[model samples]
Target: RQRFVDKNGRCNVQHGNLGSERAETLMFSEHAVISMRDGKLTLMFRVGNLRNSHMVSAQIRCKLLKSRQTPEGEFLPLDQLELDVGASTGADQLFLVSPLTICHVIDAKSPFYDLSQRSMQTEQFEVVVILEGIVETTGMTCQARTSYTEDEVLWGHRFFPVISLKVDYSQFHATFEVPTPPYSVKEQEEMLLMSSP
Candidate 1:
């Protein structure tokens, strides 16, 4: 439904991109989206505080490392593209809580391309994620960063919810949970071997 108020009575919407209105209560989970055939990767995470103290939102961006080999078996930086995941919280809520997914497609201008499971595992590339937002109360800006390598990515599996929430009185509480792996260890090893470079 559309909302409208008196023209003289204006309200302000204040929140951060990835943190709470206070900026001190930012939180994240370790999960992501990685595809083998197209080499598209989406970093998944949840942002918000358990206390429900402030409202927040964030802008997420990413970049990859480009390297060139030297004669001495060392690598030197050439260049890479700074990619915007184009994800936002879209509103000021009590908490930014969800298994949010943001991806980058391997296109012509992208530094990377059609990465297979083997290359994704073997290739040394760094993915940097930046989250920038504002604190609602003070109008102050806050930001955070997280980076991932091959080992940090769950190539074939998506997120398995690891946290749960409950309400008591006027506050919220969290319960930690662990779900079974989407694929067995043997299955993962088989995939690794099957896609070996």
Candidate 2:
């Protein structure tokens, strides 16, 4: 996201990533990938909207930019690969209603087959996510893009459901960084953490 809106109070001139302003509406999870299990290295990230508008059919596309060499020993730098995030699964088109999580399942057929906590440290790669959708109110197409480098992703850690959860009156008011919470919000978080077995 372009950081020009200072304190959400003043606009500090115009030296920013244009069209990227839509990033204000599109919010990503605090971290790139949350956690994994079941011998499947799934990269999960949450997406949500800050505006009270309909942004639908957000077609998600994720690409794995990993550099590698082939048997011929050619330098295949930053070779782009696709990470399966439900091309056939209904999860692909996000309604941006309740906030959604995109899970890139890494299976035997996945491009991330050999990916592991160990191997992750020795390699340099990145995961790029593209969100394509139409702002229903205006019927205009809006796009948002973000990237996660190897260091930003995780292996054993899971995203705390509560944290996967905003922008706002104070900006910080909706963020989890502070302890203040509305029981309406605080209660739900405790409900999940209370009985994690």
Candidate 3:
């Protein structure tokens, strides 16, 4: 008997695209998609030979910037808001917290914040999200999506290219660079990743 292997190393399911790279280190493949529906953030990850652990709607908290204070002294609808995945706690649950926590608290410091002030105050907010976790599909799937389970925080901020799934570790390698920084709702969701040289 004889067997053969493909040079591309890509299986029929996973095309093996580099997707997108961040700062030359982290890589966000065009593999998965995140969608916000009903009131929850759903994640639809592309599966090649891996099984997902199932993601559920979770509540999250974090600090807010002092310069941009919330009107109600609570989780404002316009404050920075995002979901945190594969947190340091090592749980497979989706955390709905402030965008500040998404980047600074959970991962690393966001490269978009103005850190010139030391006496700044940060607030934390929580938003209700939908139920569905991940949906397996074929031909360009919408892996993960998030929406307002309730009222969203309100605040005027920057604009970035943050999109789709907050992060994707479906490959589940022992060690892979995940999303560290969180983008303020104010930003225009400008979070793209490019492979480093």
Candidate 4:
């Protein structure tokens, strides 16, 4: 396998090194991961929830992750998560990485993910979304929007460098659900069989 790429899209092993310029991108590629749990390939990260305490719905735009194959690598797309603003002053599940550091693995070919093929190679997907206006509903929807985004690398068996993104959460309302990544061959077959005659 090729050397891992850092967050800045460089392949250098040094902590402060940059990654290669040949990195691929995907639509809504902000999050993607594939994991092996008890002899089963599971999409660990994909769909997630963004909690919003803001009562009023509004329009917003944020960046999603894009991904691709590292030539002859074994990195698979898996788990995903993001944040919703106006719910509070902090966001959820957001991560920050240095330009020349390690980051997450993103993919665009997954059907379960809601991105198009053209966005496959992009480092980040620009998500322009609107939150549904909340009418007198009281529960956890009355709190301030959270601006908290975390930082941690998405692991995969591939080359060096990872994609970095700067997320800006605009004001918005409503409950949104992200889709789970994709399934492996076996899982897909099982799903097909279950849904077929």
lDDT of 3: 0.27
- Assess the local accuracy of residue 14 in candidate 3 as a C-alpha lDDT between 0 and 100: 24
lDDT of each: 0.46, 0.60, 0.27, 0.29
Q: Comparing 1 and 4 by TM-score, which wins?
A: 1
Q: Give candidate 3 regions above 4 Å deviation.
A: 1-77, 81-85, 93-139, 143-197
- TM-scores of all models? 0.51, 0.65, 0.18, 0.19
Preferred candidate (TM-score higher): 1 or 3: 1
Which candidate order results from sorting by TM-score in descending order?
2, 1, 4, 3
Give the candidate number with the greatest lDDT.
2
**Decoy 2 TM-score against native:** 0.65
Candidate 1 lDDT over 1-197, as tens digits, reads 32222255432222224323444333443444454323333333344332333325555567776576768978677445575454334332222333234555434344544454566656777677666654556546666667666566555555433332321211111222233234433345567899999
- lDDT value, candidate 4, whole model: 0.29
Residue range 1-197, candidate 2, lDDT tens digits: 54433575443332222243444644565556534434444667767654534464578888989788999999897898888888887778876544566887766566666565566677688888888886757767777777888787755555444322122212211222222221222333455689788
- Runs of candidate 4 with Cα error greater than 4 angstroms are 1-29, 46-51, 54-137, 140-184, 187-197
Query: Ranking by lDDT, best first?
Result: 2, 1, 4, 3
Better of 1 and 3 by lDDT: 1
Please report how far candidate 4 places residue 169 from its true position, in Å: 15
Model 4 C-alpha lDDT per residue in residues 81-186, reported as the tens digit of each score? 3323223432322222112111222233333233222223333432222223232245333211122112211222122223322211211111123343344444
Model 1, global lDDT: 0.46
